Write a protein that binds this ligand. Structure first.
Ligand SMILES: C[C@H](O)C(=O)Nc1cc(Cl)cc(Cl)c1
Ligand SMILES: C[C@H](O)C(=O)Nc1cc(Cl)cc(Cl)c1
Ligand code: NA
Ligand code: NA
Lengths: 301, 301
């Protein structure tokens, strides 16, 4: 029993974290095979950040301008190239701890573990979701750029996020491991603000199914709803629209509990209307939206 | 910025989990050098659990009765003994990934990371606190026994917990790595229950400091109080007494924010008496007590 925000075991990722230094800037790189992946703003000064010309800054760099340190060992950089907003440094040594891995770009609402690191050494691991506004609500201090997010389904690490920056509202923006930002952000010091955040409706529903599975039914009711009537109510609470895709994804959890999806949607509608009236659901006094249907199935009975 | 429930990187502990089977019971073991540590109830059958005589049940066992699996490799048991409620299995192979480590016993209110495992395979990591009633609010399913809790100090893994059982309220109970239970529990199938719990006051105050560091300040006020006055309030709301030692531990946070501990106690007093009036603190509608002062400091530096 119990239900916890659970991250993936981070060991396979720890073995890939290295330190990248350019001039006075130091941040984290991801060492996979003979390539080290890191944010390209490692090559900027603060004066460069307002309008950086990355091709121009990079063409002035030699391989020996990049210091890559893996634990105690210096790695020798033998090549470098830029792909979108990540720098790819070729090193002379393949990472002997390289796991089975792949790069995956994820959709808003998906969750992943974050291995926060500073100076190439891991600091902690925690669970995150990609918000509908393409930010993440993480915990990053200065020096954490290059920290990566990942899932480990079976023995393959699927890398899905690398950290680049904090927006003024305290949320965080990054790229996939091909260097493409999530959302409309740029590796540039401009007036860019995240769109208004919404609640991941499908995840709240999965987490309500999780509450039933662990034996709590107090929030159900005798009512149902059409899909469109549910969405008309949910947008009024800044909930994300629920699509037929989301209805399909919830099917297995519906069958395990015996509660049809739209009946669970009626219960969520009443929770939004009533609040919780002093009770809790899986130990939380708010409706939790950072557990996916997949996450619930992995953790629950 | 940001504040998340954060676990230690679990790699150093992942390399120590093995599968241990005795008959039809299979659970997890902790493999350090040439000894595997696991709960002693692995040797019991279902009817044995009703009233086990572990000394007699172990005399009837011999080395070959213990199948130990380090991934795909079989470890050969060359000896077996008991320390309190954990079974120590001598093996023929020293673990080559044995990290620097200590066995420590933690105090109620202290936090640690749990690496949940099933069949010797790590499946997830999360952060836990030893509750004042000596239980932990974990997330475990059948087969998780032998999962370990740990802190990492510098390079050293401090093992503090081994999972043994779940209680009827869905919370969890276990031993230290020397086999001594946390709390008044026994490794036997009998009627056991968690006692009434209390809130860890020093941890709530630390979390309130974490909220101020992250720009959440609406609960601060002009007032101060005394240890004696506040502890009267603390007793009323089922909060642990705040001691002079707790005020000292909160020293580093009281300076960084320029907010005296008794100054902050006035804020918590008001939150306890009046509630939160629809607002949240670090995204929570209840007062979080599973962050120690150190947890706050380490994450905010
Ligand atoms: C939110 C603001 O626009 C910002 O944080 N910009 C920035 C982006 C990168 Cl990728 C690196 C640095 Cl140092 C600053
Ligand atoms: C709460 C109940 O008394 C219980 O969970 N008893 C138990 C203890 C251990 Cl250590 C192992 C098993 Cl299988 C059952
Ligand atoms: Na490193
Ligand atoms: Na005050």
């Amino acid at each position: 029993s119990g239900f916890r925000k659970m991250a993936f075991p981070s060991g396979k990722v720890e073995g890939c974290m290295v330190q990248v230094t350019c001039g006075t800037t130091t941040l984290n790189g991801l060492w996979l095979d003979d390539v080290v992946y890191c944010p390209r703003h490692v090559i900027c000064t603060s004066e460069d950040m307002l309008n950086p010309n990355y091709e121009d800054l990079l063409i002035r760099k030699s391989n020996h301008n990049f210091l890559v340190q893996a634990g105690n060992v210096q790695l020798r950089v033998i090549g470098h190239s830029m792909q979108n907003c990540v720098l790819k440094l070729k090193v002379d040594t393949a990472n002997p701890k390289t796991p089975k891995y792949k790069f995956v770009r994820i959709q808003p609402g998906q969750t992943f573990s974050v291995l926060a690191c500073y100076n190439g050494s891991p600091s902690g691991v925690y669970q995150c979701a990609m918000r509908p506004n393409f930010t993440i609500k993480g915990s990053f201090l200065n020096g954490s750029c290059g920290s990566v997010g990942f899932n480990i389904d079976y023995d393959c690490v699927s890398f899905c996020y690398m950290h680049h920056m904090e927006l003024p509202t305290g949320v965080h923006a990054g790229t996939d491991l091909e260097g493409n930002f999530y959302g409309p952000f740029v590796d540039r010091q401009t007036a860019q603000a995240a769109g208004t955040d919404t609640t991941i409706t499908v995840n709240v529903l999965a987490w309500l199914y999780a509450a039933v599975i662990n034996g709590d039914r107090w929030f159900l009711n005798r009512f149902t709803t059409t899909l469109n009537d549910f969405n008309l109510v949910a947008m009024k609470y800044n909930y994300e629209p629920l699509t037929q895709d989301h209805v399909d994804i919830l099917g297995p959890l519906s069958a395990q509990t015996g509660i049809a999806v739209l009946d669970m949607c009626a219960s969520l509608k009443e929770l939004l209307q009533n609040g919780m009236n002093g009770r809790t659901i899986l130990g939380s006094a708010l409706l939790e939206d950072e557990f996916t249907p997949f996450d619930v199935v992995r953790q629950c009975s």
